[PDB]
Structure formats: C-alpha cells, structure tokens
Amino acid sequence: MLEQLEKKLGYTFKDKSLLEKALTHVSYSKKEHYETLEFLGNALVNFFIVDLLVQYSPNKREGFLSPLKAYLISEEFFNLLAQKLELHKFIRIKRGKINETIIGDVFEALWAAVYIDSGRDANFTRELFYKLFKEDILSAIKEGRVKKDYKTILQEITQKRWKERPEYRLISVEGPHHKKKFIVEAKIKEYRTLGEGKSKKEAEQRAAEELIKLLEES
Amino acid sequence: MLEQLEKKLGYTFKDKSLLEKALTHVSYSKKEHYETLEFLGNALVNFFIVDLLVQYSPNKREGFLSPLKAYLISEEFFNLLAQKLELHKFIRIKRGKINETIIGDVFEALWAAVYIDSGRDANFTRELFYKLFKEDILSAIKEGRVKKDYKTILQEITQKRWKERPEYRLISVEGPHHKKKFIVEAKIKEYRTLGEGKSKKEAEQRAAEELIKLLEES
RNA sequence: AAAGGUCAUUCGCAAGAGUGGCCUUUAU
RNA sequence: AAAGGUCAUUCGCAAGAGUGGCCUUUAU
Ligand SMILES: [Mg+2]
Ligand SMILES: [Mg+2]
C-alpha cells in the first residue's frame, strides 16, 4: 500500500511509521497523528515555494508577490499538487471524510515526514519536491495574476472619488444557526445596494459588487 | 568593514554585492536594496525557527506552538538575536534612522543572502544560523508562555459566563491627525468602562482591562 | 503579509519616493 | 495561524473528542 505512495513520491522511508503518521488523522489515532508534522511541513513547503517565487516571478513588487504566494500555499493549490499523489487512498481517518482540508494538511505533513526521515536534509527534500512540482509551480507563477475582491475595489473607488469609505449595514439574518442567510446593505453618499450570502462578508462582497456597478452607471 | 560582519556571521561571501544588497535600504539605493531578500529570508528563518520549535517545545499543542512561533519570528525577537551582529553599524540608509523595523528586515535579508551566496545550501545556512542562535531560541522556547491580551480574555470571560461578547464604541477623538487620542467604551450586560490610547485598539485594550476588573469586583 | 485613504516630516526642479502616526479592506 | 462562544452532525455511559456552518478576539 505505502510502497505505492513511496513510488509516486520517489522516496522510500527508512521509518514507515513516520510515513503513516503523516497519513494519519487524529480521529484514527489520537496518539500518532499528523498535526505536529503539518506544523513543520507548512514552514518547510512555504520555504520551497517562496524560493521559487523569488527566482522566477516576473513581477517582484510586494503587492504582487504577497497575494500570489498566498495562493501558492493555499489549500486549493496544495490539493491541486496532491492529485498526482492520490493521497485520498493512503489517508487514515475515522470520524470524517477526506475533504480538501485534510488533503492539504496531509500534503504538508507528508513533506515534513520526508524531511525528518532523510535525517533532516532540507536540500534533498527541496529537490525531491521540485522534481515533483517545480514545473507546476513555475507554470502557475508565469500565469500569476493578483485579483482584488469587490470590498477592496469599492473602497479604493470611493476613497479616490470622495475620499470616504462605504458603510456596510446588516439588514437581515434568517435560517437555522447551522445555515444562516445574511442580507447586508452597502452605502456611499446616497447610493445603496443590497447583498446576501451565507456569511456577513459574503453578503457584503455581493453588496459591494453591486454598488460598484451602480456607481458605473453614475 | 564587511569583513567584520562576515567574521561575526562566521561566513565569507563570494559575491560581496549580495551581502551589500542585504544591508541596503531602498533610500540609499533605488535599484539594489534588501526588499526581495527580506521576502525570502522571512520564509527561510521561519523554517529554521519552526524546526527547532517542533523538536524542543515543552508543549506540542497548536494553541501553544502558534502564539510562541509568532513571537519567535517577531521583529522584537529578531532585534534581540541581531544585537550580537551589530547590524546598526553595517546598514546603509539615507531617509531616516536605523530603527527596529529596519534591523529586523535586514536580519531576514542577510540570511537570504547567505542562503543564496552559498549556492542555495539550506542545510549549511540552517547550521550557521543555529551556531549563532540555537541557544537563544531554545532558551526562549523553554520560557515559552502564551500571553493573552485583555480583549481576548474579556470575551472568553463573558462568553463562558453569558455566552455573549462585549461591545466597543468610540466616545471621542482628540489631537492632530498624526497624533490622535481615542477614548473608547467597553460594555457587557449593564457594565461599561472607558479606555484611552493612541489607536482604537490600544484604547479598547485598555477599556477591556478595566471591564475585567469591574467584573471581578462584581 | 499585502492594498487604498489620510496627517506629519524628509529628499526631489517635477515625477515620484523614504520615514513615523492614524483609519479601513483583504489574506492566513 | 491560533483562541473563545454557538448550531448541526458523528463517536461516547460520561468526561470529552472529530467533522461541517456561523459569530468574535488576537497575531502577521
Ligand atoms: Mg494546513
Ligand atoms: Mg520583515
């Protein structure tokens, strides 16, 4: 079973218990799970990615590098990189389903495990990591594009035009506690739009997206 | 002069312009300054710190490791570790004076410089880093303690007791725009307290501290 | 950690930038 | 990234825990 993953990883563990720990969620084993390895892998993987980002990024301005780095270490991207490994069929869990949060954390812990198993050889681990994902990362860096959210876009418009910030007002809150529906109002000067979502922010983001369009019509 | 810093670092650079760039603020050189190196150094050092932290921490709980890690990569701590280096006498800058934010950023950039100049040798750089600071880090980790802020403590108190959170509002704002004084009000149930500070958060932190007392005195 | 506004101050013919304080938005 | 409250759900005699939703605090 593990031999398969080791083959996809291109690395054979000296300590197989270290590899399964990385693959084990707290629900399956409360004494030997990946939580602490995840803490380490996050730092480790963060380093490998930044190093690539600094070398190959077309734009080295902080406002570009920071948002892009955040995406390159996001759960989303990690799940994207993990596909190749098929972690979903090596992961051990009980009270839960192997969602994208679990996958991303196991991905991080998995890299910490390799690092440790190899006698804490960062250089070796970085290369193994690059041999597997360098191209995929450089690819995403080349097609890198920072995109602002509506709430941010809106206040930059209003701070430019009237040097003021839009007022977000909570209008309604319906539904059961585990699935609420929020209706918020965005207002600037005398303009006001509405927005709804499953969270205040989502609702405000919708509201803001409207106030922008509203303002375009002038 | 650079030779003096290399002796403190315990490493001789092949590319001196690299060491120089790490020491150079944008005010002194618009084209070759430490901004990008700082980006990378932060990631590299974060990894050095975390690795030590997962191996030597008294407590491995997320709620302990996280707050503690935050302090271990904070500007405050880096200035502490950087003292020994006397970076203040090596940093190049025009517009301003070498403050703790500068020192902290140059500390990070410097390690990025060492990393790159050594041909991206992570193991080497890590050991050089430890040779200089492992002792100080282990010591801080041994004294490691999570310090909660008043606002956090207040809502945990009010949420345990009443399942509700305190509320803040600004009472008044005094002084010039570049030096304001805020007076804020903190409340829970029928209890209200005031606090003042150079910012809303400082004011609220102060107000929260007062309300905690008010609650103890019942 | 990044983004916008703003006050002060510094460099600058200008453009524009540095530094310090404040407000807000985003991400983790 | 961490902390606290809350709803749902799963495991549990209980304590307590896991997973999903929401609110909030902190840090960068
Ligand atoms: Mg994670
Ligand atoms: Mg920094």
XYZ file of C-alpha atoms (C1' of nucleotides) and ligand atoms in Angstrom:
494
model
C 0.000 0.000 0.000
C 2.552 2.584 1.184
C 5.080 1.241 -1.314
C 2.730 2.671 -3.948
C 2.842 6.167 -2.477
C 6.589 5.861 -1.924
C 6.785 5.094 -5.637
C 4.720 8.186 -6.575
C 6.835 10.268 -4.192
C 10.025 8.663 -5.433
C 11.260 8.125 -1.895
C 11.419 5.088 0.356
C 11.094 5.767 4.075
C 13.560 4.222 6.483
C 10.885 4.587 9.165
C 7.496 3.556 7.713
C 5.757 4.605 10.941
C 6.830 8.166 10.196
C 5.129 7.956 6.794
C 1.870 6.599 8.190
C 1.866 9.155 10.976
C 1.844 11.825 8.265
C -1.105 9.982 6.715
C -2.999 9.533 9.992
C -5.727 11.906 11.154
C -6.443 12.372 14.870
C -9.781 10.546 14.511
C -7.963 7.325 13.579
C -5.156 7.663 16.115
C -5.218 10.208 18.913
C -1.640 9.377 19.862
C 0.094 9.216 16.482
C -1.327 11.721 14.009
C -0.010 14.280 11.529
C -0.858 17.529 13.396
C 2.679 18.379 14.531
C 4.202 17.260 11.230
C 1.722 19.557 9.493
C 3.032 22.492 11.545
C 6.559 21.665 10.294
C 5.606 20.883 6.690
C 3.828 24.213 6.357
C 7.047 26.072 7.202
C 9.070 23.722 5.026
C 6.805 23.935 1.965
C 6.372 27.666 2.480
C 10.141 27.961 2.075
C 10.389 25.841 -1.118
C 7.662 27.907 -2.786
C 8.971 31.331 -1.814
C 12.417 30.332 -3.058
C 10.963 29.526 -6.478
C 8.764 32.618 -6.444
C 11.741 34.906 -5.788
C 13.745 33.329 -8.623
C 11.164 33.063 -11.401
C 8.477 35.658 -10.699
C 8.148 38.241 -13.493
C 6.969 40.941 -11.083
C 8.868 41.305 -7.800
C 6.715 44.064 -6.294
C 5.376 43.220 -2.810
C 1.798 43.845 -3.917
C 2.193 41.090 -6.494
C 4.433 38.606 -4.677
C 2.415 38.533 -1.448
C -1.003 37.794 -2.947
C 0.499 35.249 -5.332
C 2.453 33.497 -2.564
C -0.724 33.240 -0.501
C -2.361 31.364 -3.365
C 0.682 29.150 -3.974
C 0.459 27.857 -0.370
C -3.318 27.804 -0.282
C -5.281 24.641 0.444
C -6.558 24.926 -3.111
C -3.143 24.811 -4.755
C -1.910 22.061 -2.451
C -4.891 19.890 -3.374
C -4.037 20.701 -6.981
C -0.453 19.487 -6.445
C -1.587 16.466 -4.403
C -3.703 14.918 -7.192
C -0.573 13.376 -8.670
C -0.041 11.556 -5.351
C -3.606 10.229 -4.859
C -3.379 10.819 -1.101
C -7.096 10.112 -0.706
C -6.303 6.401 -0.818
C -3.494 6.363 1.743
C -5.021 8.666 4.341
C -6.302 7.114 7.570
C -9.352 8.704 9.173
C -12.485 7.604 11.088
C -14.874 10.357 12.159
C -14.843 12.261 8.876
C -14.429 12.371 5.105
C -11.177 13.039 3.260
C -12.013 16.595 2.197
C -9.655 19.206 0.784
C -8.617 20.466 4.207
C -7.416 17.005 5.241
C -5.629 16.528 1.920
C -3.785 19.822 2.167
C -2.659 19.151 5.729
C -1.547 15.613 4.889
C 0.313 17.074 1.945
C 2.185 19.402 4.315
C 2.813 16.753 6.979
C 3.975 14.378 4.264
C 6.757 16.777 3.324
C 7.780 17.199 6.967
C 7.984 13.388 7.260
C 10.298 13.075 4.258
C 12.458 15.874 5.650
C 12.774 14.137 9.008
C 13.152 10.600 7.636
C 16.027 11.754 5.451
C 17.904 12.905 8.552
C 16.556 16.437 8.275
C 18.106 17.019 4.850
C 16.426 20.204 3.596
C 18.437 20.301 0.368
C 17.427 16.759 -0.524
C 13.763 17.340 0.360
C 13.610 20.591 -1.597
C 14.929 18.823 -4.702
C 12.557 15.897 -4.339
C 9.766 18.494 -4.026
C 10.979 20.319 -7.135
C 11.383 17.102 -9.094
C 7.680 16.561 -8.480
C 6.201 20.075 -8.576
C 8.725 22.677 -9.786
C 7.254 22.893 -13.289
C 3.712 23.029 -11.924
C 4.684 25.943 -9.691
C 6.679 27.843 -12.317
C 3.691 27.324 -14.563
C 1.312 28.945 -12.078
C 3.824 31.727 -11.357
C 4.070 32.590 -15.049
C 0.283 32.794 -15.337
C 0.153 34.555 -11.986
C -2.473 37.259 -11.624
C -3.402 39.188 -8.484
C -7.136 39.861 -8.328
C -8.795 42.199 -5.861
C -12.062 41.414 -4.110
C -15.047 43.732 -4.505
C -14.966 45.162 -0.976
C -11.372 46.237 -1.617
C -12.111 47.579 -5.102
C -15.117 49.547 -3.862
C -13.347 51.403 -1.050
C -10.486 52.331 -3.372
C -13.013 53.825 -5.778
C -14.837 55.736 -3.037
C -11.608 56.830 -1.359
C -10.431 58.179 -4.701
C -13.659 59.969 -5.629
C -14.954 61.227 -2.279
C -12.079 60.209 -0.019
C -14.548 58.199 2.076
C -15.348 54.545 2.779
C -18.648 52.721 2.101
C -20.896 51.874 5.040
C -21.959 48.252 5.409
C -25.198 47.710 7.274
C -26.610 44.350 8.330
C -30.229 44.174 7.201
C -31.496 40.654 7.852
C -30.428 37.265 9.250
C -32.614 34.243 8.501
C -32.339 30.472 8.612
C -31.225 27.888 11.204
C -28.000 28.572 13.105
C -26.039 25.983 11.105
C -27.120 27.592 7.839
C -27.872 31.286 8.193
C -28.725 33.706 5.403
C -27.343 37.236 5.681
C -28.670 40.326 3.928
C -26.458 43.400 4.076
C -26.678 46.919 2.684
C -23.761 48.817 1.174
C -23.998 52.617 1.139
C -21.843 55.506 -0.078
C -23.071 59.111 -0.164
C -26.677 58.443 -1.149
C -26.075 55.245 -3.104
C -27.172 51.969 -1.515
C -27.224 48.373 -2.714
C -28.124 45.039 -1.154
C -26.357 41.720 -0.929
C -26.912 38.310 0.595
C -24.767 35.298 1.370
C -24.027 32.570 3.905
C -21.750 34.924 5.880
C -21.608 38.653 6.615
C -18.543 39.042 4.432
C -20.032 37.084 1.528
C -23.130 39.272 1.765
C -21.035 42.460 1.955
C -18.944 41.279 -1.001
C -22.139 40.845 -3.039
C -23.431 44.211 -1.844
C -20.130 45.871 -2.790
C -20.122 44.233 -6.217
C -23.486 45.928 -6.785
C -22.517 49.377 -5.506
C -19.616 49.316 -7.960
C -21.863 48.518 -10.921
C -24.329 51.043 -9.524
C -21.624 53.706 -9.493
C -20.523 52.852 -13.034
C -23.925 53.936 -14.349
C -23.098 57.077 -12.374
C 34.075 46.797 7.192
C 32.140 43.975 5.500
C 34.911 41.630 6.619
C 33.922 42.464 10.201
C 30.346 41.344 9.664
C 31.484 38.192 7.885
C 33.580 37.359 10.923
C 30.554 37.799 13.208
C 28.426 35.741 10.829
C 31.197 33.188 10.508
C 30.879 33.147 6.712
C 32.778 34.757 3.842
C 30.795 35.845 0.795
C 31.783 35.038 -2.759
C 29.554 37.811 -4.123
C 30.036 40.886 -1.919
C 27.385 42.886 -3.750
C 24.923 40.313 -2.426
C 25.959 40.895 1.181
C 25.821 44.641 0.460
C 22.341 44.434 -1.032
C 21.070 42.754 2.147
C 22.405 45.699 4.145
C 20.982 48.315 1.784
C 17.698 50.147 2.337
C 15.839 51.480 -0.716
C 16.509 55.079 0.408
C 20.243 54.582 -0.203
C 19.907 52.593 -3.429
C 16.746 52.532 -5.520
C 17.983 49.631 -7.633
C 19.841 47.290 -5.259
C 18.155 47.059 -1.857
C 17.077 44.292 0.567
C 13.286 44.111 -0.098
C 13.266 40.844 -2.073
C 15.905 39.175 0.051
C 13.783 40.030 3.081
C 10.823 38.236 1.493
C 12.917 35.072 1.118
C 14.738 35.424 4.457
C 11.464 35.556 6.315
C 10.474 32.200 4.777
C 13.884 30.663 5.388
C 14.200 31.781 9.035
C 10.568 30.849 9.710
C 11.559 27.328 8.736
C 14.697 27.366 10.909
C 12.660 28.544 13.901
C 9.787 26.121 13.368
C 12.084 23.101 13.048
C 13.709 23.907 16.384
C 10.296 24.609 17.888
C 8.766 21.245 16.969
C 11.776 19.440 18.393
C 12.255 21.302 21.654
C 8.902 22.762 22.687
C 7.605 21.747 26.150
C 4.064 21.693 24.751
C 3.153 20.483 21.238
C -0.416 21.827 21.296
C -1.418 24.117 18.403
C -2.662 26.720 20.849
C 0.790 26.847 22.427
C 3.064 26.434 19.403
C 1.273 29.087 17.320
C 1.445 32.018 19.738
C 5.020 31.095 20.626
C 6.100 30.794 16.996
C 4.642 34.238 16.347
C 6.901 35.722 18.992
C 9.911 33.730 17.773
C 9.751 35.288 14.292
C 8.671 38.702 15.515
C 10.579 41.892 14.853
C 11.131 42.166 18.609
C 12.902 38.790 18.807
C 14.958 39.313 15.656
C 16.267 42.581 17.067
C 17.239 40.537 20.114
C 19.161 37.978 18.021
C 20.602 40.677 15.773
C 22.210 42.620 18.668
C 25.189 40.289 18.658
C 25.661 41.186 14.972
C 25.723 44.969 15.497
C 23.909 45.404 12.157
C 23.297 49.047 13.044
C 26.921 49.747 12.138
C 26.661 47.983 8.753
C 23.238 49.035 7.411
C 23.198 51.612 4.589
C 20.343 54.130 4.546
C 19.521 57.797 3.779
C 15.919 58.786 4.563
C 15.722 58.131 8.292
C 17.444 56.236 11.081
C 18.062 52.528 11.645
C 15.028 51.511 13.708
C 13.881 48.073 14.878
C 11.800 47.531 11.727
C 14.905 48.103 9.617
C 17.104 45.844 11.768
C 14.504 43.092 11.677
C 14.217 43.264 7.895
C 17.975 43.324 7.347
C 18.354 40.349 9.689
C 15.975 38.383 7.440
C 17.572 39.612 4.193
C 21.033 38.718 5.478
C 20.090 35.069 5.943
C 18.531 35.052 2.497
C 21.843 36.457 1.213
C 23.875 33.785 2.977
C 21.488 31.165 1.617
C 21.834 32.365 -1.992
C 25.581 33.076 -1.891
C 26.282 29.594 -0.549
C 24.582 28.310 -3.693
C 21.186 27.806 -2.053
C 22.547 25.413 0.554
C 19.695 25.182 3.057
C 21.395 22.720 5.430
C 24.512 24.860 5.621
C 22.628 28.096 6.259
C 20.456 26.412 8.888
C 23.522 25.197 10.798
C 25.233 28.577 10.538
C 22.018 30.101 11.886
C 21.858 27.624 14.750
C 25.550 28.002 15.515
C 24.736 31.631 16.321
C 21.207 31.451 17.727
C 20.155 27.915 18.682
C 20.974 28.642 22.332
C 18.907 31.850 22.479
C 15.973 30.192 20.744
C 15.924 27.112 22.984
C 16.079 29.421 25.957
C 13.103 31.498 24.790
C 11.263 28.257 23.988
C 11.958 26.971 27.494
C 10.421 30.154 28.966
C 7.758 29.898 26.280
C 4.422 31.177 27.523
C 1.252 32.322 25.784
C 0.328 35.857 26.859
C -3.326 36.618 26.162
C -4.408 40.193 25.509
C -7.214 41.810 27.513
C -9.848 41.899 24.735
C -9.361 38.169 24.178
C -9.546 37.445 27.915
C -12.630 39.619 28.313
C -14.747 37.898 25.668
C -13.693 34.477 26.891
C -14.876 35.537 30.326
C -18.173 36.987 29.067
C -18.713 34.084 26.667
C -18.186 31.485 29.402
C -20.483 33.291 31.809
C -23.134 34.710 29.491
C -22.481 33.275 26.023
C -22.171 36.873 24.789
C -19.357 39.150 23.676
C -18.552 42.681 24.866
C -19.087 45.688 22.609
C -16.980 48.744 21.911
C -17.733 52.173 20.540
C -15.691 55.335 20.185
C -16.508 58.111 22.667
C -14.188 60.869 21.393
C -11.059 61.561 19.322
C -8.634 64.396 20.185
C -5.452 65.931 18.790
C -3.875 66.325 15.300
C -4.241 63.658 12.605
C -0.648 62.444 13.121
C -1.127 62.107 16.870
C -4.691 61.292 17.929
C -6.125 60.373 21.306
C -9.047 57.957 21.367
C -11.485 57.324 24.175
C -13.487 54.143 23.729
C -16.210 52.467 25.752
C -16.370 48.754 26.567
C -19.590 47.115 27.712
C -21.195 43.810 28.657
C -24.673 43.485 30.148
C -25.085 46.631 32.271
C -21.357 47.169 32.811
C -19.437 49.847 30.915
C -15.889 51.163 31.147
C -13.750 53.702 29.317
C -10.214 53.428 27.970
C -7.950 55.761 26.008
C -4.984 55.259 23.691
C -3.062 56.271 20.569
C -5.269 53.975 18.468
C -8.729 52.419 18.657
C -7.308 49.013 19.541
C -4.995 50.373 22.216
C -7.999 52.254 23.626
C -10.210 49.144 23.527
C -7.462 47.004 25.075
C -7.281 49.489 27.926
C -11.115 49.604 28.234
C -11.270 45.803 28.210
C -8.772 45.668 31.063
C -10.958 47.994 33.133
C -14.117 45.981 32.487
C -12.335 42.813 33.577
C -11.619 44.475 36.926
C -15.142 45.847 37.169
C -16.372 42.292 36.706
C -14.028 40.839 39.332
C -15.184 43.418 41.865
C -18.613 42.258 40.656
C 1.627 39.848 4.783
C -0.278 42.869 1.133
C -3.821 47.095 -0.732
C -6.316 52.168 -0.518
C -7.139 56.971 2.162
C -5.080 60.439 5.370
C -1.751 63.657 8.875
C 3.319 64.882 9.923
C 8.145 65.027 8.250
C 12.433 64.315 4.742
C 14.595 64.016 -0.402
C 13.264 65.851 -5.078
C 13.190 71.116 -10.455
C 8.997 67.678 -11.297
C 7.602 62.916 -11.470
C 7.945 60.379 -7.604
C 9.978 58.246 -3.143
C 11.616 57.345 2.123
C 10.286 57.533 7.348
C 6.779 57.969 11.556
C 1.233 58.243 13.368
C -3.988 57.143 12.207
C -8.341 54.894 9.568
C -10.167 50.878 6.517
C -10.141 46.456 3.177
C -8.120 41.552 2.047
C -5.489 37.036 3.086
C -3.577 33.166 6.581
C -2.169 30.864 12.118
C -4.118 30.356 16.794
C -8.165 31.328 20.771
C -13.363 31.570 22.742
C -18.872 31.147 22.043
C -22.710 28.913 19.139
C -25.749 25.411 15.591
C -25.772 20.759 13.207
C -23.762 16.005 12.934
C -20.750 11.552 14.310
C -18.371 8.673 18.463
C -19.026 8.318 23.754
C -22.264 5.744 29.938
C -19.998 10.248 30.996
C -15.988 13.446 30.586
C -14.566 14.657 26.217
C -13.410 14.474 21.016
C -13.896 14.549 15.465
C -16.291 16.931 11.099
C -19.333 20.903 8.745
C -21.794 26.149 9.258
C -21.868 30.915 11.764
C -20.164 34.993 15.214
C -15.996 37.236 17.527
C -10.800 38.205 19.572
C -5.657 38.119 18.590
C -1.305 37.852 15.604
C 1.392 38.586 10.868
Mg -2.624 23.278 6.973
Mg 10.165 41.603 7.744
